[PDB]
């Protein structure tokens, strides 16, 4: 039971972060932070400076 819950659990958190980055890219920060790869449910990566 633990393996299935942990996964789903570790996937909803990742989505939360990608959404936030996209939202920030609009309003305040803007074209200074970029996403380079988001395969869903596994990982993401951000670029800066």
């Amino acid at each position: 039971m633990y393996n299935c819950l942990h996964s789903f659990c570790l996937s909803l958190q990742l989505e939360v972060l990608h959404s936030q980055t996209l939202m920030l890219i609009r309003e305040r920060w803007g074209d200074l932070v970029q996403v380079e790869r988001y395969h869903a449910g596994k990982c993401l990566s951000l670029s800066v400076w």
Binding site: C4, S7, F8, S11, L12, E15, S19
Partner: peptide
């Protein structure tokens, strides 16, 4: 005598869950 329009994502995770964890009955 309501939906906050985020089911366009959580649904996908569930599908990824079901596609990866088939019921055992």
């Amino acid at each position: 005598f309501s939906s906050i329009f985020q089911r366009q994502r959580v649904d996908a995770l569930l599908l990824d869950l079901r596609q990866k964890f088939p019921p055992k009955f």
